[PDB]
Design a binder for this molecule. Sequence first.
Ligand SMILES: *[C@@H]1O[C@H](CO[C@@H]2O[C@@H](C)[C@@H](O)[C@@H](O)[C@@H]2O)[C@@H](O[C@@H]2O[C@H](CO)[C@@H](O[C@@H]3O[C@H](CO)[C@@H](O)[C@H](O)[C@@H]3O)[C@H](O)[C@H]2NC(C)=O)[C@H](O)[C@H]1NC(C)=O
Ligand SMILES: *[C@@H]1O[C@H](CO[C@@H]2O[C@@H](C)[C@@H](O)[C@@H](O)[C@@H]2O)[C@@H](O[C@@H]2O[C@H](CO)[C@@H](O[C@@H]3O[C@H](CO)[C@@H](O)[C@H](O)[C@@H]3O)[C@H](O)[C@H]2NC(C)=O)[C@H](O)[C@H]1NC(C)=O
Ligand SMILES: *[C@@H]1O[C@H](CO[C@@H]2O[C@@H](C)[C@@H](O)[C@@H](O)[C@@H]2O)[C@@H](O[C@@H]2O[C@H](CO)[C@@H](O[C@@H]3O[C@H](CO)[C@@H](O)[C@H](O)[C@@H]3O)[C@H](O)[C@H]2NC(C)=O)[C@H](O)[C@H]1NC(C)=O
Ligand code: CA
Ligand code: CA
Ligand code: CA
Ligand code: CA
Ligand code: CA
Ligand code: CA
Length: 316
Amino acid sequence: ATIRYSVAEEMESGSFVANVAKDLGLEVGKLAERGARLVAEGNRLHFRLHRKTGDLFVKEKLDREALCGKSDPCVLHFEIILAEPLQSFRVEVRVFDINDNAPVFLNKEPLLKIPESTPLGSRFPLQSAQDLDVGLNGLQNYTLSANTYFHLHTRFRSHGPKYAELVLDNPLDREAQPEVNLTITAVDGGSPPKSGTANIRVVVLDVNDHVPQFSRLVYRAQVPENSDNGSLVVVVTATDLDEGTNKQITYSLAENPEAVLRTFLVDPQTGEVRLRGPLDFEMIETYDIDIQATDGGGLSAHSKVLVEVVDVNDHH
Ligand SMILES: *[C@@H]1O[C@H](CO[C@@H]2O[C@@H](C)[C@@H](O)[C@@H](O)[C@@H]2O)[C@@H](O[C@@H]2O[C@H](CO)[C@@H](O[C@@H]3O[C@H](CO)[C@@H](O)[C@H](O)[C@@H]3O)[C@H](O)[C@H]2NC(C)=O)[C@H](O)[C@H]1NC(C)=O
Ligand SMILES: *[C@@H]1O[C@H](CO[C@@H]2O[C@@H](C)[C@@H](O)[C@@H](O)[C@@H]2O)[C@@H](O[C@@H]2O[C@H](CO)[C@@H](O[C@@H]3O[C@H](CO)[C@@H](O)[C@H](O)[C@@H]3O)[C@H](O)[C@H]2NC(C)=O)[C@H](O)[C@H]1NC(C)=O
Ligand SMILES: *[C@@H]1O[C@H](CO[C@@H]2O[C@@H](C)[C@@H](O)[C@@H](O)[C@@H]2O)[C@@H](O[C@@H]2O[C@H](CO)[C@@H](O[C@@H]3O[C@H](CO)[C@@H](O)[C@H](O)[C@@H]3O)[C@H](O)[C@H]2NC(C)=O)[C@H](O)[C@H]1NC(C)=O
Ligand SMILES: [Ca+2]
Ligand SMILES: [Ca+2]
Ligand SMILES: [Ca+2]
Ligand SMILES: [Ca+2]
Ligand SMILES: [Ca+2]
Ligand SMILES: [Ca+2]
């Protein structure tokens, strides 16, 4: 009823396809004589017939991804018309698929920002790739680069892979490495398989999971009673391994006896523990002051400075 042939994709134009006279029920001379003409719909003119030889050539480089797109059978139809007697013959040439397209990502550099306090076992979806081929020549599998935090889990469908997702195996600690960088690899199933890699940048968001720590737990100080107002008792420092607003330190005098808050002050920024009142050895020999370093998130830490006034009042 209908005659068909098979051709390979992306072969050079003018290349041979088949010989018509054989499977037409005629001979070459008959083809030349009966006026063998190729006719199809106006839009498609993919082939060419040489009458005198009965030879079928392809007129253009056939690109299957353009003609059929994502369709499994790529078939081109056209009819051979004759004359005396006037016969019409339906011909269909199938364009086989080859592996001339590798998988690719639209974002070669995706940006995935994961908070530091992320529960172990959490999953992060990744955008799939695009292999324009069909079947085994299309997408088949994903792989993840060597890593100490993640492992890749590829959600599959019946025909092909749905998409891939990162699964966290280890607790993310920003203080260790604030960023982890990876390369996802998309692999088809052709022979040889073709690959397409993308580069994921995983940024770890700082969480206030670090209380400020004072240098010394106890600050020893020996201050002369005849010292002036605003004289520097001591300088205290507090460190925070975090970043952002969860790092800046706010020093403060809190929960102290009246005398302390009456004769002492502290600089909220620098840590300048200084005087705001007079001193007399006979009245108060020693002060013990608990200062408080407060973090932006609210994590506070205490430390006591033990001041001891020196020299009898007006001894020298
Ligand atoms: C999709 O691909 C994954 C992993 O990728 C494949 O396996 C690698 C080892 C390489 O050979 C890649 O070229 C290849 O694409 C497949 O899952 C994995 O299959 C392998 C089969 O050998 C399993 O072997 C393991 O090997 C390690 C050490 O090499 C051992 O510690 C394991 O105990 C085990 O023997 C592996 O467990 C398995 N999973 C992972 C995460 O690698 C997957 O089968 C494939 N799917 C399809 C449909 O192709
Ligand atoms: C994110 O990480 C990628 C991955 O780096 C690669 O993966 C690791 C797991 C290891 O296997 C590394 O050995 C491997 O490079 C980085 O991509 C890499 O970029 C560099 C330069 O930007 C590329 O360097 C090469 O150097 C050789 C010899 O010097 C040249 O011949 C190459 O032409 C190339 O210049 C490296 O090839 C490339 N790796 C891959 C797989 O593409 C990426 O830089 C990094 N990004 C960030 C922001 O950290
Ligand atoms: C000894 O010094 C303290 C503190 O001096 C302060 O710190 C220095 C580094 C400089 O920056 C000074 O400019 C700064 O004042 C003195 O205590 C402070 O006195 C001033 C003025 O009396 C107070 O300012 C105001 O006081 C009025 C009074 O009603 C309030 O209403 C205002 O709100 C405003 O606070 C200031 O509060 C007070 N305390 C501090 C911690 O600065 C002190 O007067 C001086 N002399 C003696 C004898 O102690
Ligand atoms: Ca192609
Ligand atoms: Ca193809
Ligand atoms: Ca392919
Ligand atoms: Ca931490
Ligand atoms: Ca942190
Ligand atoms: Ca902190």
